[PDB]
């Protein structure tokens, strides 16, 4: 009778040294009970995660599996502990099996990409098009300069199709795709679509959750 959860949060010391802030994780398009979030972790950050606020699941729970693909260095005995300071893409997959959930936690490298007509029409992960990564909690990811004109497209890289984890700028805010998108973001609304030309760059700040074309 159980279905996969609709919400995921993360909580811990890289957000609030008091564990009082719960980051709601963005949901992976078209795939149920999978979530992703771009977070800076300090060295020996401690965190847990949960489905609702004030649920605390940690590394020792037998429903839980960790997969490190970022060299974050994940360990701990209750809390999750991330050894190496860095931006990482925190990624959770909750699947039903039996009457309980079964979590897969994956750290992906902080890899953000420009796609689409703004790039001369790359529709695949291509390292010419990867944002540089800021050193601090508060820096920006910045794209390389665009080489053509059109709608801007942006995504993170995972083991899934790119467009399942892509996003844009609505009103200075970072908006993660949550509908069926075919030709353009204007399918959502305008000032969801974001018009670029040769020379432009994006700045993203994922701590704030904002960004801007420049």
Ligand X SMILES: OC[C@H]1O[C@@H]2O[C@H]3[C@H](O)[C@@H](O)[C@@H](O[C@H]4[C@H](O)[C@@H](O)[C@@H](O[C@H]5[C@H](O)[C@@H](O)[C@@H](O[C@H]6[C@H](O)[C@@H](O)[C@@H](O[C@H]7[C@H](O)[C@@H](O)[C@@H](O[C@H]1[C@H](O)[C@H]2O)O[C@@H]7CO)O[C@@H]6CO)O[C@@H]5CO)O[C@@H]4CO)O[C@@H]3CO
Q: Which residues does the annotation place in the binding site for D-glucose?
A: 153, 162, 177-182
- Output the six-digit token pair for 150: 């059109």
- Taking the complex as a whole, the smallest distance from the CB of residue 136 to ligand X amounts, in Å, to 23
Closest separation in Å from C-beta 214 to ligand X = 39
Q: How far is the CB of 48 from ligand X (least distance, A)?
A: 6
Phi and psi angles of residue 63, each rounded to the nearest 5 degrees, phi first:
-80, -5
The reply on whether position 19 binds ligand X by CB under 6 A is yes
User: Which residues 6+ apart lie within 8 Å of 83 measured at CB?
Assistant: 43, 44, 72, 73, 74, 75
Give the DSSP letter string of 57-77.
Answer: B-TT-TTEEEEESS---EE-S
Ramachandran sector of residue 128 (left: φ over 0; alpha: ψ -120 to 50; beta: rest): alpha
State the pairing for strand pair 210-213/166-170.
Answer: unpaired
Of 12 and 150, nearer to ligand X (C-beta) is: 12
Task: Please report whether residue 75 would count as binding ligand X according to CB under 6 A.
Answer: no
Q: What's the min distance (Å) between Cβ of 59 and ligand X?
A: 11
| 163 makes contact with ligand X (CB under 6 A) | no
Residue 79 found at the interface with ligand X (CB under 6 A): yes
Asked if 16 contacts 23 with a C-beta cutoff of 8 angstroms, the reply is no
Q: Which x/- pattern over 53-72 shows residues binding ligand X (rule: CB under 6 A)?
A: ---x----------------
**Annotated binding-site members:** 153, 162, 177-182
Please say which residue, 79 or 207, places its beta carbon nearer to ligand X: 79
- Residue 64's DSSP bridge partners are 103
Q: Give the tokens for residue 184.
A: 């353009």
Nearer to ligand X among residue 61 and residue 161 (C-beta): 61
When the beta carbons of 56 and 162 are compared against ligand X, the nearer one is 56
Decide whether 79 or 165 has the Cβ nearer to ligand X. 79
In whole angstroms, give the CA distance from residue 197 to residue 133: 22
Q: Taking a C-beta distance cutoff of 8 angstroms, is the pair 207, 141 a contact?
A: no
Discontinuities in the chain with C to N beyond 2.5 Å fall right after: none
Asked if 76 interacts with ligand X (CB under 6 A), we say: no
Q: Report if residue 23 touches ligand X, rule: CB under 6 A.
A: no
CB of 65 to ligand X, least distance (A): 19
Which chain residues interact with ligand X by CB under 6 A? Answer: 19, 46, 48, 56, 79
């Amino acid at each position: 009778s159980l279905t996969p959860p609709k919400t995921m949060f993360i909580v811990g010391s890289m957000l609030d040294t008091d564990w009082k802030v719960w980051k709601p994780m963005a949901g992976v398009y078209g795939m149920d009970g999978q979530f992703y979030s771009m977070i800076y972790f300090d060295a020996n950050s401690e965190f847990k995660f949960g489905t609702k606020e004030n649920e605390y699941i940690g590394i020792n729970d037998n429903r839980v599996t960790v997969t490190d693909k970022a060299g974050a260095g994940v360990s701990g005995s209750d809390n999750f502990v991330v050894e190496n300071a860095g931006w990482y893409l925190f990624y959770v997959k909750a699947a039903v099996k039996g009457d309980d959930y079964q979590f897969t936690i994956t750290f992906y490298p902080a890899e953000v990409y420009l796609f689409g007509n703004t790039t001369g029409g790359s529709w695949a992960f291509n390292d010419e098009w990867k944002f540089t990564v800021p050193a601090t909690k508060d820096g920006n990811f910045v794209s390389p300069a665009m080489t053509a004109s059109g709608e801007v497209r942006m995504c993170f890289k995972t083991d899934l199709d790119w467009w399942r984890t892509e996003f844009t700028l609505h009103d200075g805010e970072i908006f993660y795709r949550d509908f069926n998108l075919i030709d353009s973001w204007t399918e959502k609304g305008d000032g969801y679509s974001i018009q670029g030309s040769a020379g432009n760059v994006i700045h993203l700040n994922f701590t704030a959750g904002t960004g801007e074309k420049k």
